[PDB]
């Protein structure tokens with residue numbers, strides 16, 4: 001192995017600063033488009049991160065951002081992945097110029113759902129699913145990335161429910177109260193991600209702080225219907241937020257629900 005020779009990279013454009021590193025667009029061996037992510041020095045538990053990155057090189061799905069290889073014989077480490085020309089899903093949703101149809105928003109949900117069903121089938125949790133960790137290619141296809149990487153973050157503001165950078169707004173009650181992660185905490189976050197999509201990238205619980213969000217969820221209260229979601233779309237995202245984790249659906253059930261709504265609506 002998975003080691004790419006960094007001398008085979010041509011850097012063409014600075015894409016900016018993403019979460020945990022700078023990303024560049026470039027080519028590999030003069031021909032192939034790639035994204036090159038330079039992992040910020042001191043941000044990750046490096047040996048654990050590299051070992052898991054190499055295991056993850058064996059994952060492949062049309063709706064997962066493909067990992068190609070790594071460059072670990074110098075610092076910063078580089079991760080070489082599929083290049084997603086339309087960038088981060090959250091930024092993309094927030095651009096009102098796109099004038100999305102709701103059928104396009106439901107297709108974005110389905111793309112993510114397929115990717116998560118595949119990760120679950122391979123025994124992987126995402127652990128930080130959110131629009132900010134999804135990317136959009138030149139054809140408008142949404143794919144999931146950054147699966148599992150929260151496990152290697154060294155900054156304590158990101159790693160426990162008490163932290164300022166912890167994804168409180170994408171967490172179920174058992175995560176906020178007891179740090180209980182499971183396939184069902186990924187299901188809850190997926191429902192929040194459908195809410196982000198149908199809200200065109202609004203922050204979940206936008207009028208609340210993280211502390212107030214945790215209290216809201218502790219009182220059994222939830223997000224409410226985005227204007228663009230139909231009653232059936234809202235029923236699907238809401239089903240992800242059952243207080244009892246065992247009552248939440250699986251990704252395979254959500255996928256069936258989404259396809260049924262697509263056929264019915266649009």
Ligand SMILES: Nc1nccn2c([C@@H]3CC[C@H]4CCC(=O)N4C3)nc(-c3ccc(C(=O)Nc4cc(C(F)(F)F)ccn4)cc3OC3CC3)c12
Nearest residue numbers: 016017018023035037053079083084087088133145146147
């Ligand atoms: N592939 C990309 N293509 C185009 C743009 N991209 C950006 C932009 C950065 C600037 C901001 C600014 C605005 C914008 O659109 N932005 C997006 N980040 C990535 C990107 C590249 C690599 C990985 C990456 O290395 N992922 C990874 C790596 C592993 C590992 F191998 F390490 F294990 C496992 C799982 N996933 C993740 C990426 O984006 C994260 C999802 C949002 C990419």
Ligand SMILES: Nc1nccn2c([C@@H]3CC[C@H]4CCC(=O)N4C3)nc(-c3ccc(C(=O)Nc4cc(C(F)(F)F)ccn4)cc3OC3CC3)c12
Nearest residue numbers: 004027028029032033034057058059060061066067068069
């Ligand atoms: N890593 C994989 N693991 C398992 C399955 N895989 C599949 C399946 C093929 C059958 C279909 C059918 C059904 C299914 O699930 N499918 C998926 N493709 C890849 C895979 C995808 C992309 C690249 C890839 O493009 N790699 C790359 C790319 C570059 C670049 F040129 F971009 F720079 C440089 C270096 N490496 C490499 C792949 O596997 C080979 C073993 C490593 C992988």
